[PDB]
Ligand binder design. Structure first.
Ligand SMILES: *[C@@H]1O[C@H](CO[C@@H]2O[C@@H](C)[C@@H](O)[C@@H](O)[C@@H]2O)[C@@H](O[C@@H]2O[C@H](CO)[C@@H](O)[C@H](O)[C@H]2NC(C)=O)[C@H](O)[C@H]1NC(C)=O
Ligand SMILES: *[C@@H]1O[C@H](CO[C@@H]2O[C@@H](C)[C@@H](O)[C@@H](O)[C@@H]2O)[C@@H](O[C@@H]2O[C@H](CO)[C@@H](O)[C@H](O)[C@H]2NC(C)=O)[C@H](O)[C@H]1NC(C)=O
Ligand SMILES: CN(C(=O)Oc1ccc2ccccc2c1)[C@@H]1C2CCN(CC2)[C@H]1Cc1cccnc1
Ligand SMILES: *[C@@H]1O[C@H](CO[C@@H]2O[C@@H](C)[C@@H](O)[C@@H](O)[C@@H]2O)[C@@H](O)[C@H](O)[C@H]1NC(C)=O
Ligand SMILES: *[C@@H]1O[C@H](CO)[C@@H](O)[C@H](O)[C@H]1NC(C)=O
Ligand SMILES: *[C@@H]1O[C@H](CO)[C@@H](O)[C@H](O)[C@H]1NC(C)=O
Ligand SMILES: *[C@@H]1O[C@H](CO)[C@@H](O)[C@H](O)[C@H]1NC(C)=O
Ligand code: NA
Length: 526
């Protein structure tokens, strides 16, 4: 099958899924390759072609540093890129149901990776189950990460910042101009993303240039008000200069700095990225979104507080154990290979690692709030406290504050709390329901019975896929047929959320109320 797009014809491939057929277009380009004089610049328009483009295999993933903290360990390496790294990586993928739909709702996926890593060709990001089972069209794109995507000299168009976000935005533009030719409705487009991807989705809610490119939005374990998500103009400039010094590109004319960095090999930029910050944590975002004056016209906390964003429905949620994954990447006493029982002194050492530029009193307040033991004789007490500190501060409390702030302006919002630790995961049990552990359930991998998942997990993923699809089509994430718990809207007063698990789906209220009042009200002062 061939499809005629605004820039030329493209050829796809057929996929047998669950006794049916999905058509896949892997690797359509959506911008001029950002090479040479184009490195660090906004993505440039793609000039037509007269031939048939073969969209039949995933394209190159963008340049990035690979995670090698556990070589040969599937739990980390399944997130490493699975196609060639290259600066020529501005490509996207399309999964359309067969037979060609007539006006299908589109789901657009934005992967995370701390704004430094990630790629849309990962196995857990395969859109074919969602297209087969729910008849939505799934789209995903590669966008530039790290310094190649977010190096910032604010004002200077040679390196204005936010290039990865403008990559995402240009791919959404492609969906507006082209997806009807695939049988999709450009007027029913839902963005969804996880971690830095979720943060990216929330920034598309703020950026006026994105407001007409999508309908609704789904935020999984991530939002732009998280402490890691937005870099100040101060830090962005300092870090760009630290990178120029690290590569001998230090000049006085700032444009001549950008020209000097353009002649460095992609690798040489990648190797020095890590050292532009003085103190780093497992959650560092060396090069990330900034207030560029273009994509972000003001500091996003101000735009949230004052209601400056797209008015629409949102679906937001978090996992029970967001913080645990990061503890084995540097906290003393922790290991994926033992139950990581830490002492009080090890907990305090852990805080120094995750809170380097915090005052001494700051660290003492975290200690005080989180070690008032109900039972001090539990040896996992400190182990669990440090995970909860990292998870509440970095993910859960910013997600709730974003949802409260957002709903206060009249829009329907739905909040979930994902608490299933799946059956086949390679990380140990003490890490619980880890960051990223819901992606496979959202994409419907447990719907594959040969994939070593339990039956309860197939049921959970089936219900989640239905709710996500109903949210994208209708703005309302119910499973209306199989006698399911209704999912109430999240209001600022009552703060009802839905829990997702294989046992009992429950309505609860005011998630982490005492912990988030600490982080969101007391702590930012320090
Ligand atoms: C495809 O459907 C759209 C309408 O989509 C629905 O309405 C949206 C506002 C949004 O809520 C979606 O989730 C819905 O599924 C049709 O749009 C109409 O287009 C005509 C042009 O002929 C226009 O005059 C109408 O005002 C539009 N209706 C709207 C905006 O509701 C569109 O034509 C459909 N196209 C095909 C080929 O089926
Ligand atoms: C759990 O292991 C940590 C990490 O130690 C490493 O991984 C282990 C699985 C094993 O292969 C060790 O030999 C490795 O060093 C242990 O913390 C270490 O403790 C030693 C003293 O025994 C100390 O010298 C190291 O600096 C520690 N390493 C770190 C990263 O803190 C920890 O003691 C183990 N915990 C439990 C409860 O068994
Ligand atoms: C891939 N991997 C990773 O990239 O996680 C980071 C790394 C740095 C971050 C900095 C700030 C904010 C969030 C960050 C997240 C994480 C890492 C820990 C837990 N499993 C396994 C390894 C992954 C979860 C995941 C999967 C896809 C996208 N995201 C996260
Ligand atoms: C693009 O692909 C064309 C056809 O691909 C081949 O034929 C189809 C029917 C499938 O079986 C497919 O897997 C085969 O590889 C080629 O003829 C054409 O040269 C390709 N264009 C390139 C490589 O630039
Ligand atoms: C950048 O930050 C580093 C670390 O804080 C510091 O040493 C340096 O003075 C800052 N400024 C410049 C211009 O390098
Ligand atoms: C910096 O370089 C640019 C690009 O060549 C040039 O237009 C500008 O005059 C230079 N400015 C200074 C102060 O050297
Ligand atoms: C509803 O229940 C039936 C069995 O009674 C099951 O096969 C089906 O997939 C379920 N659907 C959803 C959307 O959960
Ligand atoms: Na209550």
């Amino acid at each position: 099958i061939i499809i005629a797009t605004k820039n030329g014809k493209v050829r796809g491939m057929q996929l047998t899924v669950f006794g049916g057929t999905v058509t896949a277009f892997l690797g359509i380009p959506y911008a001029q390759p950002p090479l040479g004089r184009l490195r660090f610049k906004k993505p440039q328009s793609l000039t037509k072609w007269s031939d048939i483009w073969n969209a039949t295999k995933y394209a190159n993933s963008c340049c990035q540093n690979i995670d090698q903290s556990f070589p040969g360990f599937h739990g980390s390496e399944m997130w490493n890129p699975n196609t060639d790294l290259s600066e020529d990586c501005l490509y996207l993928n399309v999964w359309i149901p067969a037979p060609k739909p007539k006006n299908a709702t589109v789901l657009i996926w934005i992967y995370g990776g701390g704004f430094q890593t990630g790629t849309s060709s990962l196995h857990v990001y395969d859109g074919k189950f969602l297209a087969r089972v729910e008849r939505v069209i799934v789209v995903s794109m590669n966008y530039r990460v790290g310094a190649l995507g977010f190096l910032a000299l604010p004002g200077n168009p040679e390196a204005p910042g936010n290039m990865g976000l403008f990559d995402q935005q240009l791919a959404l533009q492609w969906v507006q101009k082209n997806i009807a030719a695939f049988g999709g409705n450009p007027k029913s487009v839902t963005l969804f993303g996880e971690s830095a991807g979720a943060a990216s989705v929330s920034l598309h809610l703020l950026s006026p240039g994105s407001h007409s490119l999508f309908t609704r939005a789904i935020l999984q374990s991530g939002s732009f008000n998280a402490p890691w998500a937005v870099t100040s103009l101060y830090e962005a400039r300092n870090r760009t200069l630290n990178l120029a010094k690290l590569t001998g590109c230090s000049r006085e004319n700032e444009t001549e700095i950008i020209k000097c960095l353009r002649n460095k090999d992609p690798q040489e930029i990648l190797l020095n990225e890590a050292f532009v910050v003085p103190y780093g944590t497992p959650l560092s975002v060396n090069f990330g979104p900034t207030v560029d004056g273009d994509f972000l016209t003001d500091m996003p906390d101000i735009l949230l507080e004052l209601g400056q964003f797209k008015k629409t429905q949102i679906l937001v949620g978090v996992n029970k154990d967001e913080g645990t994954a990061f503890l084995v990447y540097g906290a003393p006493g922790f290991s994926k290979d033992n139950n990581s029982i830490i002492t009080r002194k090890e907990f305090q050492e852990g805080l120094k690692i995750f809170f380097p530029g915090v005052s001494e009193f700051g660290k003492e307040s975290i200690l005080f709030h989180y070690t008032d033991w109900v039972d001090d004789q539990r040896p996992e007490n400190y182990r669990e406290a440090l995970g909860d500190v990292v998870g509440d501060y970095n993910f859960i409390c910013p997600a709730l504050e974003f949802t409260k702030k957002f709903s206060e302006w009249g829009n329907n919002a739905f909040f979930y709390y994902f608490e299933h630790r799946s059956s086949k995961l390679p990380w140990p049990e003490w890490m619980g329901v880890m960051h990223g552990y819901e992606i496979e359930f959202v994409f419907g991998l447990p719907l594959e019975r040969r994939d070593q998942y339990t039956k309860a997990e197939e049921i959970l993923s089936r219900s989640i896929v239905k709710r996500w699809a109903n949210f994208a089509k209708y703005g309302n994430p119910q499973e209306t047929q199989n006698q399911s718990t209704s999912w109430p809207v999240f209001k600022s007063t009552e703060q009802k959320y839905l829990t997702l698990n294989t046992e009992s789906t429950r309505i609860m209220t005011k998630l982490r109320a005492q912990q988030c009042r600490f982080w969101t009200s007391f702590f930012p002062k320090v």
